[PDB]
Design an enzyme around this catalytic site. Structure first.
Site, PDB file in Angstrom:
ATOM      1  N   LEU A  20       0.554  -1.406  -0.584  1.00 18.18           N
ATOM      2  CA  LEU A  20       0.095   0.040   0.367  1.00 18.18           C
ATOM      3  C   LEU A  20       1.067   0.805   0.072  1.00 18.18           C
ATOM      4  O   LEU A  20       1.514   1.527   0.735  1.00 18.18           O
ATOM      5  CB  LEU A  20      -1.165   0.298   0.851  1.00 18.18           C
ATOM      6  N   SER A  70       8.025   1.241   6.873  1.00 17.90           N
ATOM      7  CA  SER A  70       6.540   1.494   6.551  1.00 17.90           C
ATOM      8  C   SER A  70       6.110   0.086   5.553  1.00 17.90           C
ATOM      9  O   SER A  70       6.595   0.609   4.681  1.00 17.90           O
ATOM     10  CB  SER A  70       6.203   2.505   6.176  1.00 17.90           C
ATOM     11  N   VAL A  81       3.189  -2.002   4.969  1.00 19.84           N
ATOM     12  CA  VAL A  81       1.432  -2.277   4.819  1.00 19.84           C
ATOM     13  C   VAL A  81       1.652  -2.388   3.561  1.00 19.84           C
ATOM     14  O   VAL A  81       1.467  -2.077   2.241  1.00 19.84           O
ATOM     15  CB  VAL A  81       1.333  -1.341   5.024  1.00 19.84           C
ATOM     16  N   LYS A  83       0.439  -5.341   8.303  1.00 20.97           N
ATOM     17  CA  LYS A  83       1.438  -3.984   8.507  1.00 20.97           C
ATOM     18  C   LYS A  83       2.745  -5.503   9.243  1.00 20.97           C
ATOM     19  O   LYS A  83       2.431  -5.961  10.405  1.00 20.97           O
ATOM     20  CB  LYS A  83       1.086  -3.729   9.239  1.00 20.97           C
ATOM     21  N   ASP A  95      -0.612  10.095  19.219  1.00 20.79           N
ATOM     22  CA  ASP A  95      -0.498  10.576  17.822  1.00 20.79           C
ATOM     23  C   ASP A  95      -1.620  10.620  16.416  1.00 20.79           C
ATOM     24  O   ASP A  95      -2.011  10.364  15.918  1.00 20.79           O
ATOM     25  CB  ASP A  95       0.651   9.978  17.178  1.00 20.79           C
TER      26      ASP A  95
HETATM   27  O1  LIG Z   1      -2.239   2.637   5.929  1.00 13.74           O
HETATM   28  C1  LIG Z   1      -2.955   1.776   7.137  1.00 13.74           C
HETATM   29  C2  LIG Z   1      -2.780   1.384   8.014  1.00 13.74           C
HETATM   30  C3  LIG Z   1      -2.945   1.131   8.956  1.00 13.74           C
HETATM   31  C4  LIG Z   1      -2.924   0.392  10.370  1.00 13.74           C
HETATM   32  C5  LIG Z   1      -3.354   0.164  11.650  1.00 13.74           C
HETATM   33  C6  LIG Z   1      -3.439  -0.285  12.656  1.00 13.74           C
HETATM   34  C7  LIG Z   1      -2.030   0.205  13.198  1.00 13.74           C
HETATM   35  O2  LIG Z   1      -2.038  -0.241  14.352  1.00 13.74           O
HETATM   36  C8  LIG Z   1      -0.857   0.647  12.342  1.00 13.74           C
HETATM   37  C9  LIG Z   1      -1.804   0.623  10.572  1.00 13.74           C
HETATM   38  O3  LIG Z   1      -4.550   0.196   8.725  1.00 13.74           O
HETATM   39  C10 LIG Z   1      -4.524  -0.024   7.678  1.00 13.74           C
HETATM   40  C11 LIG Z   1      -6.216   0.103   6.964  1.00 13.74           C
HETATM   41  C12 LIG Z   1      -6.681  -0.533   5.490  1.00 13.74           C
HETATM   42  O4  LIG Z   1      -7.837  -0.732   5.612  1.00 13.74           O
HETATM   43  C13 LIG Z   1      -5.409   0.761   4.702  1.00 13.74           C
HETATM   44  C14 LIG Z   1      -4.617   1.208   5.446  1.00 13.74           C
HETATM   45  O5  LIG Z   1      -4.071   1.691   3.731  1.00 13.74           O
HETATM   46  C15 LIG Z   1      -3.803   1.150   6.066  1.00 13.74           C
END
Ligand SMILES: O=c1cc(-c2ccc(O)cc2)oc2cc(O)cc(O)c12
EC number: 2.7.11.1
Length: 318
Positions: free
Chosen positions: A44, A45, A47, A62, A146
């Site tokens: 999509l 660091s 992810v 993640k 944050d």
């Molecule tokens: O970029 C994203 C980052 C996260 C995310 C969600 C929880 C966290 O503790 C760290 C990162 O969830 C997502 C969930 C989605 O459905 C789509 C995303 O782009 C993300």
């Protein structure tokens, strides 16, 4: 000499009076799942878009970079504790085979294109949904630390919202001193900017205020500094210098060698002055009075998330 200590107005002892297995993340038994349940489809660091093989369900994985085991544990335990809270990102799984967190899938509406479609009613609605997440997590003894637009996923096409990225979150303990590096510079409360370490849930309420301000006034970010020193100056130019020194005095804070002079003198500005011809449709007197009650120097006199949901601003959305 030294600074005056501080305790949270609300939810002071929710971790204190709960069993050790709730808040003590460093000595937590993490039950690891299997990475082979999931198929990575696209980045999509680290992810990744993914599909759960066991049911064809869309997920977001993640993959956790080489960070301390206690930071992985902190995030895991917090997400587990908050699973099921309104508008908190759902942790579907935690997997090994090198650790990864698996979340429910969410669409993200392209900002700008979100920022051009949004009406006054949409902002009230989405601010309300963030507030349900903050009241819930604060009541569970958790600070997010944050809160900012990049951590608030709005899926406008489905009128959906999730508070994400709980990697910087912490459990609140009265008397505890916390790191002041956390949060984006632009959403750092005055307490973090003056190096006052004994902060609480009220930090997230400041960050939320900066979020509303920049959304209704259409300027990202609202307070824009190049360092922590200038950031306080930018806030002072709007909230005024008098209420700032009343705050320094109350908690016996000693300013850095640089704060003294850069401050100068500033009166409190009415919020109405920032309404111009491009952002007029998003602003109301209700919106301005709600913003004023969130963005106060004094962390102990900021609206709580619950108090905020009772403001006339949200009347049409409740
Ligand atoms: O970029 C994203 C980052 C996260 C995310 C969600 C929880 C966290 O503790 C760290 C990162 O969830 C997502 C969930 C989605 O459905 C789509 C995303 O782009 C993300």
């Amino acid at each position: 000499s030294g600074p005056v200590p501080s305790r949270a107005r609300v939810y002071t002892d929710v971790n204190t009076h709960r069993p050790r297995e709730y808040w003590d993340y460093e000595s937590h038994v993490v039950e690891w799942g299997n990475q082979d349940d999931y198929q990575l489809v696209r980045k999509l660091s680290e992810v990744f878009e993914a599909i759960n093989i066991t049911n064809n369900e869309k997920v977001v994985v993640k993959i956790l970079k080489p960070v301390k085991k206690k930071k992985i544990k902190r995030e895991i335990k917090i997400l587990e504790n908050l699973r099921g809270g309104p508008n908190i990102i759902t942790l579907a799984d935690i997997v090994k085979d090198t650790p990864a967190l698996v979340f429910e899938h969410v669409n993200n509406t392209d900002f700008k294109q979100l920022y051009q479609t949004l009406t006054d009613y949409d902002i009230r609605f989405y601010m309300y949904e963030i507030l349900k997440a903050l009241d819930y997590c604060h009541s569970m003894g958790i600070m997010h630390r944050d809160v900012k637009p990049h951590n608030v996923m709005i899926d406008h096409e489905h009128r959906k919202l999730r508070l994400i990225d709980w990697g910087l979150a912490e459990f609140y303990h009265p008397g505890q001193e916390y790191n002041v590096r956390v949060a984006s510079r632009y959403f750092k409360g005055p307490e973090l900017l003056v190096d006052y370490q004994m902060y609480d849930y009220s930090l997230d309420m400041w960050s939320l205020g900066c979020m509303l301000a920049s959304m209704i006034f259409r300027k990202e970010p609202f307070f824009h500094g190049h360092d922590n020193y200038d950031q306080l100056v930018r806030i002072a130019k709007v909230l005024g210098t008098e209420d700032l020194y009343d705050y320094i005095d109350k908690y016996n804070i000693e300013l850095d060698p640089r704060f003294n002079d850069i401050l100068g003198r500033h009166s409190r500005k009415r919020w109405e002055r920032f309404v111009h011809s491009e952002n007029q449709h998003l602003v109301s007197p209700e919106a301005l009075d709600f913003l004023d009650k969130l963005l106060r120097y004094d962390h102990q006199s900021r609206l709580t998330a619950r108090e905020a949901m009772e403001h006339p601003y949200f009347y049409t959305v409740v």
